[PDB]
Amino acid sequence: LTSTERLIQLFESWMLKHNKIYKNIDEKIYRFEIFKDNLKYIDETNKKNNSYWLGLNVFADMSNDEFKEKYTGSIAGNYTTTELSYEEVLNDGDVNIPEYVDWRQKGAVTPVKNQGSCGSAWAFSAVSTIESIIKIRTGNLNEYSEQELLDCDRRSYGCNGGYPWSALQLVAQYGIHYRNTYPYEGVQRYCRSREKGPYAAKTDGVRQVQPYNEGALLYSIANQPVSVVLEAAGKDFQLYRGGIFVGPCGNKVDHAVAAVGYGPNYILIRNSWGTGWGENGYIRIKRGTGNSYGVCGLYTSSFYPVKN
């Protein structure tokens, strides 16, 4: 709507769908001042005859603003160095396989989630490292827990910052409850793995996919629910909606979630942000490229589950 006055019913119409709250009388209204140019940020960004477009609303109050610290928020700090090097590897050669399969038709994924004021997000992935590995040979259902491996993993913080290495790698000697049995509020001072019911989540030998490799990772795209790590470009992709990407990005990884989705020049995923960005809960980076590092630090190695 190009008419200044006719933009008001949105605040009304918009907020109804994905939350109605605010700061208060004076301060909140400010949410409306840096979302005023919602369409400016896209209008043509879309006009891009390009390979990526992405639509508006999940929060345009959210993008460049302090919000980028919301999303990205985790990890950071010191290097999140990788590859256990040995053990995480080989017994697979050429391909002689289809580059395509999905989990958007089988139904292997549980409704991901939009938590709260702190994104320990880095911990969502783990809850996934197993979320679907369950059917691989057992057909077992249900989900384990969130807050745990976010509360028992002292190894580091998950709020203001969270480590991607120890939520899945410390999974065999303690174990973890279910999603229902232990939903979370906002942090968990009293972390109880030996105290939350009993033993439920026991690993086997987290199989790290060849680092800096856009090759063998396809077994982890189809023979398991891939869970790499990418760049949380707290900006333009921070309002990402649909399409395939080539971006505007910046390879230096930021967030590590579920990577369930690979095909021709498509490839889904799992994005626990919510019901609007990275469409409903997924994405798709432009496959078949030429640069390892490329953009959005994807194919720079995983650490997924296999049943020993």
Short mmCIF file of N, CA, C and O in Angstrom, two decimals, residues 33-99:
data_model
loop_
_atom_site.label_atom_id
_atom_site.label_comp_id
_atom_site.label_asym_id
_atom_site.label_seq_id
_atom_site.Cartn_x
_atom_site.Cartn_y
_atom_site.Cartn_z
N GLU A 33 8.55 1.70 13.38
CA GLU A 33 9.43 2.65 12.73
C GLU A 33 10.54 2.04 11.87
O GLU A 33 11.02 2.69 10.95
N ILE A 34 10.95 0.82 12.18
CA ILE A 34 12.00 0.16 11.40
C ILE A 34 11.50 -1.12 10.73
O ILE A 34 12.21 -2.12 10.62
N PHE A 35 10.26 -1.05 10.30
CA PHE A 35 9.57 -2.12 9.60
C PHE A 35 8.72 -1.34 8.57
O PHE A 35 8.01 -1.91 7.73
N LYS A 36 8.82 -0.01 8.65
CA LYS A 36 8.10 0.89 7.76
C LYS A 36 8.51 0.61 6.33
O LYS A 36 7.69 0.63 5.42
N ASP A 37 9.80 0.34 6.14
CA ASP A 37 10.33 0.05 4.81
C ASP A 37 10.45 -1.46 4.56
O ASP A 37 11.43 -1.95 4.00
N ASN A 38 9.43 -2.18 5.00
CA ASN A 38 9.39 -3.62 4.82
C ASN A 38 9.61 -3.90 3.34
O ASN A 38 10.63 -4.46 2.93
N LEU A 39 8.62 -3.49 2.54
CA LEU A 39 8.63 -3.68 1.10
C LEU A 39 9.80 -3.01 0.39
O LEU A 39 10.17 -3.42 -0.70
N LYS A 40 10.39 -1.98 0.98
CA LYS A 40 11.52 -1.34 0.33
C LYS A 40 12.62 -2.39 0.30
O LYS A 40 13.32 -2.55 -0.71
N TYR A 41 12.73 -3.11 1.41
CA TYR A 41 13.71 -4.19 1.54
C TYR A 41 13.18 -5.44 0.86
O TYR A 41 12.85 -6.39 1.55
N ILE A 42 13.09 -5.44 -0.48
CA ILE A 42 12.57 -6.62 -1.20
C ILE A 42 11.99 -6.19 -2.51
O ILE A 42 12.29 -6.77 -3.55
N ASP A 43 11.12 -5.20 -2.43
CA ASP A 43 10.40 -4.63 -3.56
C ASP A 43 11.00 -5.00 -4.90
O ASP A 43 10.29 -5.40 -5.83
N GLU A 44 12.31 -4.82 -5.00
CA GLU A 44 13.04 -5.14 -6.21
C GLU A 44 14.02 -6.26 -5.86
O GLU A 44 14.39 -7.06 -6.72
N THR A 45 14.42 -6.32 -4.59
CA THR A 45 15.31 -7.38 -4.11
C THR A 45 14.71 -8.65 -4.68
O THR A 45 15.36 -9.67 -4.88
N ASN A 46 13.43 -8.53 -4.94
CA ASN A 46 12.67 -9.60 -5.51
C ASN A 46 12.81 -9.41 -7.02
O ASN A 46 13.05 -10.38 -7.75
N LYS A 47 12.65 -8.18 -7.48
CA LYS A 47 12.76 -7.86 -8.89
C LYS A 47 14.02 -8.53 -9.44
O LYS A 47 14.30 -8.48 -10.63
N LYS A 48 14.79 -9.13 -8.54
CA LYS A 48 16.00 -9.84 -8.90
C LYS A 48 15.65 -11.03 -9.79
O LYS A 48 15.09 -12.02 -9.30
N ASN A 49 15.99 -10.94 -11.08
CA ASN A 49 15.75 -12.01 -12.07
C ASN A 49 16.62 -13.20 -11.68
O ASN A 49 16.72 -14.22 -12.40
N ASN A 50 17.26 -13.01 -10.53
CA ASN A 50 18.17 -13.94 -9.88
C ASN A 50 17.54 -15.27 -9.55
O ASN A 50 16.38 -15.54 -9.86
N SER A 51 18.35 -16.08 -8.86
CA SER A 51 17.99 -17.42 -8.43
C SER A 51 17.38 -17.49 -7.04
O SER A 51 16.90 -18.55 -6.60
N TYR A 52 17.42 -16.36 -6.33
CA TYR A 52 16.85 -16.29 -4.98
C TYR A 52 16.00 -15.03 -4.88
O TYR A 52 16.26 -14.03 -5.59
N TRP A 53 14.98 -15.08 -4.02
CA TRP A 53 14.11 -13.92 -3.86
C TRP A 53 13.73 -13.68 -2.41
O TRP A 53 14.08 -12.63 -1.86
N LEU A 54 13.03 -14.64 -1.80
CA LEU A 54 12.62 -14.53 -0.39
C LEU A 54 11.57 -13.44 -0.11
O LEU A 54 11.77 -12.26 -0.47
N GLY A 55 10.47 -13.82 0.55
CA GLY A 55 9.40 -12.89 0.87
C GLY A 55 9.42 -12.23 2.25
O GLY A 55 10.28 -12.55 3.07
N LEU A 56 8.48 -11.32 2.51
CA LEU A 56 8.44 -10.63 3.80
C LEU A 56 7.58 -11.28 4.89
O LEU A 56 6.84 -12.23 4.63
N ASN A 57 7.74 -10.74 6.10
CA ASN A 57 7.03 -11.09 7.35
C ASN A 57 7.19 -12.43 8.14
O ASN A 57 6.75 -13.52 7.74
N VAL A 58 7.83 -12.25 9.30
CA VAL A 58 8.14 -13.23 10.36
C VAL A 58 8.53 -12.19 11.41
O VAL A 58 8.50 -12.42 12.62
N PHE A 59 8.90 -11.02 10.87
CA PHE A 59 9.30 -9.85 11.63
C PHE A 59 10.30 -8.99 10.85
O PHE A 59 11.48 -9.34 10.76
N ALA A 60 9.85 -7.87 10.28
CA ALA A 60 10.78 -6.98 9.58
C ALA A 60 11.29 -5.97 10.60
O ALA A 60 12.09 -5.09 10.29
N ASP A 61 10.78 -6.10 11.82
CA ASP A 61 11.24 -5.26 12.90
C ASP A 61 12.60 -5.92 13.07
O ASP A 61 13.57 -5.31 13.53
N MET A 62 12.65 -7.18 12.63
CA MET A 62 13.85 -8.01 12.70
C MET A 62 14.60 -8.22 11.39
O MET A 62 14.03 -8.70 10.39
N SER A 63 15.89 -7.86 11.43
CA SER A 63 16.85 -7.96 10.32
C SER A 63 18.23 -7.46 10.81
O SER A 63 18.92 -8.13 11.58
N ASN A 64 18.59 -6.28 10.35
CA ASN A 64 19.86 -5.67 10.72
C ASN A 64 19.87 -5.31 12.19
O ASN A 64 20.90 -5.42 12.84
N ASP A 65 18.72 -4.87 12.71
CA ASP A 65 18.61 -4.48 14.11
C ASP A 65 19.17 -5.53 15.10
O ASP A 65 19.43 -6.68 14.72
N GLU A 66 19.35 -5.11 16.36
CA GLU A 66 19.87 -5.92 17.47
C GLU A 66 19.40 -7.35 17.41
O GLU A 66 19.98 -8.23 18.02
N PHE A 67 18.32 -7.54 16.66
CA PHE A 67 17.69 -8.84 16.44
C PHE A 67 18.68 -9.90 15.91
O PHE A 67 18.57 -11.09 16.25
N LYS A 68 19.63 -9.46 15.09
CA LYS A 68 20.62 -10.35 14.50
C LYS A 68 21.34 -11.08 15.62
O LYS A 68 21.84 -12.18 15.41
N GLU A 69 21.38 -10.46 16.79
CA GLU A 69 22.01 -11.07 17.96
C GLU A 69 21.04 -12.07 18.55
O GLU A 69 21.42 -12.98 19.28
N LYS A 70 19.76 -11.88 18.25
CA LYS A 70 18.76 -12.80 18.74
C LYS A 70 19.10 -14.10 18.01
O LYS A 70 19.67 -15.03 18.60
N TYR A 71 18.78 -14.11 16.72
CA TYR A 71 19.01 -15.27 15.86
C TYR A 71 20.41 -15.87 15.97
O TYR A 71 20.63 -16.83 16.71
N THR A 72 21.34 -15.31 15.22
CA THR A 72 22.71 -15.79 15.23
C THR A 72 23.04 -16.16 16.67
O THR A 72 23.38 -17.30 16.96
N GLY A 73 22.91 -15.17 17.54
CA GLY A 73 23.16 -15.29 18.97
C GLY A 73 24.11 -16.30 19.59
O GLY A 73 24.94 -15.94 20.45
N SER A 74 23.99 -17.56 19.17
CA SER A 74 24.78 -18.66 19.69
C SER A 74 26.20 -18.77 19.18
O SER A 74 26.69 -17.90 18.45
N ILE A 75 26.84 -19.86 19.58
CA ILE A 75 28.21 -20.16 19.21
C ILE A 75 29.03 -18.89 19.32
O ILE A 75 28.98 -18.21 20.35
N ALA A 76 29.77 -18.55 18.28
CA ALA A 76 30.59 -17.35 18.30
C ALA A 76 31.70 -17.55 19.33
O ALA A 76 32.14 -18.69 19.55
N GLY A 77 32.15 -16.45 19.95
CA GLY A 77 33.21 -16.53 20.95
C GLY A 77 34.52 -16.94 20.31
O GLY A 77 35.05 -16.24 19.44
N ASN A 78 35.06 -18.09 20.74
CA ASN A 78 36.29 -18.62 20.18
C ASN A 78 35.92 -19.63 19.09
O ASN A 78 34.76 -20.06 18.98
N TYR A 79 36.92 -20.01 18.29
CA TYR A 79 36.74 -20.96 17.20
C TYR A 79 35.93 -22.22 17.59
O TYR A 79 36.11 -22.75 18.71
N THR A 80 35.03 -22.66 16.71
CA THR A 80 34.23 -23.88 16.92
C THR A 80 34.88 -24.97 16.05
O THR A 80 34.18 -25.76 15.41
N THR A 81 36.22 -24.99 16.03
CA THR A 81 37.04 -25.93 15.24
C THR A 81 36.38 -27.29 15.08
O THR A 81 35.63 -27.72 15.97
N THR A 82 36.66 -27.97 13.97
CA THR A 82 36.02 -29.25 13.68
C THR A 82 36.83 -30.47 13.22
O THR A 82 38.07 -30.46 13.20
N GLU A 83 36.06 -31.51 12.87
CA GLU A 83 36.52 -32.83 12.41
C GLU A 83 37.24 -33.60 13.54
O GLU A 83 38.28 -33.16 14.03
N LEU A 84 36.67 -34.72 13.98
CA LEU A 84 37.31 -35.51 15.03
C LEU A 84 38.48 -36.12 14.27
O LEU A 84 39.40 -36.71 14.84
N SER A 85 38.39 -35.93 12.95
CA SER A 85 39.35 -36.39 11.95
C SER A 85 39.14 -37.87 11.68
O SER A 85 38.53 -38.24 10.67
N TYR A 86 39.63 -38.70 12.60
CA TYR A 86 39.49 -40.14 12.48
C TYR A 86 38.15 -40.58 13.10
O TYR A 86 37.53 -39.82 13.85
N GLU A 87 37.70 -41.80 12.78
CA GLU A 87 36.45 -42.39 13.30
C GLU A 87 35.19 -41.88 12.58
O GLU A 87 34.23 -42.63 12.33
N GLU A 88 35.19 -40.59 12.24
CA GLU A 88 34.07 -39.99 11.54
C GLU A 88 34.13 -40.36 10.06
O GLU A 88 33.36 -39.81 9.25
N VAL A 89 35.01 -41.30 9.70
CA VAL A 89 35.15 -41.61 8.27
C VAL A 89 35.33 -42.95 7.57
O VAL A 89 35.77 -43.96 8.12
N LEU A 90 35.00 -42.84 6.28
CA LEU A 90 35.05 -43.78 5.15
C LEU A 90 34.76 -45.27 5.11
O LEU A 90 35.12 -46.05 6.00
N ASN A 91 34.10 -45.63 4.00
CA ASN A 91 33.65 -46.97 3.63
C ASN A 91 32.62 -46.70 2.51
O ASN A 91 31.68 -47.48 2.30
N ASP A 92 32.80 -45.57 1.82
CA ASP A 92 31.92 -45.15 0.73
C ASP A 92 32.69 -44.54 -0.45
O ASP A 92 33.50 -43.63 -0.28
N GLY A 93 32.43 -45.03 -1.66
CA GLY A 93 33.15 -44.53 -2.82
C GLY A 93 32.42 -43.58 -3.75
O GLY A 93 32.06 -42.45 -3.36
N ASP A 94 32.23 -44.02 -4.99
CA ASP A 94 31.55 -43.21 -6.00
C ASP A 94 30.12 -42.90 -5.54
O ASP A 94 29.85 -42.86 -4.34
N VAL A 95 29.21 -42.66 -6.48
CA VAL A 95 27.81 -42.36 -6.11
C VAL A 95 26.76 -43.35 -6.63
O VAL A 95 26.08 -44.02 -5.85
N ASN A 96 26.63 -43.43 -7.96
CA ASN A 96 25.66 -44.31 -8.61
C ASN A 96 24.38 -44.27 -7.77
O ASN A 96 23.86 -45.33 -7.36
N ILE A 97 23.92 -43.04 -7.53
CA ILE A 97 22.72 -42.76 -6.73
C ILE A 97 21.94 -41.48 -7.14
O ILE A 97 22.51 -40.54 -7.67
N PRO A 98 20.64 -41.45 -6.85
CA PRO A 98 19.79 -40.29 -7.16
C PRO A 98 20.15 -39.17 -6.18
O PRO A 98 20.32 -39.43 -4.99
N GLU A 99 20.27 -37.93 -6.66
CA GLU A 99 20.60 -36.83 -5.76
C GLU A 99 19.37 -36.35 -5.03
O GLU A 99 19.44 -35.41 -4.23
#
